[PDB]
Design a protein around this ligand. Sequence first.
Ligand SMILES: O=C(O)C[C@H]1C[C@H](c2cccc(Cl)c2)[C@@H](c2ccc(Cl)cc2)N(CC2CC2)C1=O
Length: 125
Amino acid sequence: MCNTNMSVPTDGAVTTSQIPASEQETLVRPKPLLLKLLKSVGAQKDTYTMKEVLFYLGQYIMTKRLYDEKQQHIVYCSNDLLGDLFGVPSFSVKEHRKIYTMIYRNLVVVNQQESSDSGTSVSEN
Ligand SMILES: O=C(O)C[C@H]1C[C@H](c2cccc(Cl)c2)[C@@H](c2ccc(Cl)cc2)N(CC2CC2)C1=O
């Protein structure tokens, strides 16, 4: 949909006590639907990590103006790919135990706990 390719985050990272980087420290490859959203906002790299996928999704919600109200309780969509990975019209932003669980079912990883295979595909500029 869109393209920028003018942003490289090194120190700026997103993490909280609920589900921190200690548990979500796995490499991800470009193929599923979850990482297809951040690939258009501003993420043109070979391979990303599970912790970096949360940073690219948070920047789009702040710049496009998704959550704007006095009493923060629930956010609304504006007819975009945001409601195609989760499959809901409205969701909670401060609830970290509801958004991370959905990201764990629609993605691919390199190192797994059980013996499983997915494929091999890389995209870069
Ligand atoms: O403190 C808070 O409760 C919110 C805070 C942290 C929040 C977050 C951090 C780590 C894991 C998760 Cl799941 C969520 C993070 C965020 C990141 C990604 C999404 Cl999809 C939704 C929210 N944002 C950026 C938001 C647009 C402004 C925050 O402002």
